[PDB]
Amino acid sequence: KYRSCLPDPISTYSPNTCPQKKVVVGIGEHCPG
């Protein structure tokens, strides 16, 4: 589906809106992206 993640997803003012959530890497897993 189509889309604010503005200006950057790392320093966004509202992290609850951008779909790119911040997660940590578990055991036996890699970086999701």
Partner 1 sequence: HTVCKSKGSIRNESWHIDSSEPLCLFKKNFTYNVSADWLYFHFYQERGVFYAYYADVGMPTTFLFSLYLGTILSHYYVMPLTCNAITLEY
> Is residue 31 near partner 1 by the rule CB under 8 A?
no
The CA-atom distances, in angstroms, between 30 and each of 3, 14, 15 are 26, 26, 23
Cβ 33 to partner 1, closest distance in Å?
Answer: 11
> Is residue 30 near partner 1 by the rule CB under 8 A?
yes
> Is residue 1 near partner 1 by the rule CB under 8 A?
no
Which 7-26 residues touch partner 1, going by CB under 8 A? 26
Q: How far is Cα 33 from Cα 28, in angstroms, rounded to an integer?
A: 15
HSE-CB for 20 with a 13 A CA cutoff: 11
Q: What are the residues binding partner 1 (CB under 8 A)? A: 26-30
